[PDB]
Amino acid sequence: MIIPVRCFSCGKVVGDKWDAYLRLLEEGKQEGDALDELKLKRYCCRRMVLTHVDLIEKFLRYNP
């Protein structure tokens, strides 16, 4: 259901990190590290993407 602008817990933005992440996966095969480099330190902002379930993808396969 798309990524959440700003993390609930602390507030830090997290909109941009999406495409970046899904790439550092496909190729560079990371998790922990990718994130670390994406500047996502403390678990609070962290859990947002790693727990995000992009439903929108299946929805987009729908007509209107």
For the annotated binding site for Zn(2+), the residues are: 7, 10, 44-45
User: What is d(CA 60, CA 64) in angstroms, rounded to the nearest whole number?
Assistant: 9
16 binds, among another protein, Zn ion, none (CB under 5 to 8 A by kind): another protein
Please identify which residue in 24, 34, 45, 48 interacts with another protein, judged by CB under 8 A: 45
- Interacting residue with another protein among 6, 22, 36, 43 (CB under 8 A): 6
**Sign of the CA dihedral with 57 first, then 24, 46, and 38 last:** negative
Three-state DSSP at 35 gives helix
**Residues of this chain that bind Zn ion (CB under 5 A):** 7, 9-10, 44-45
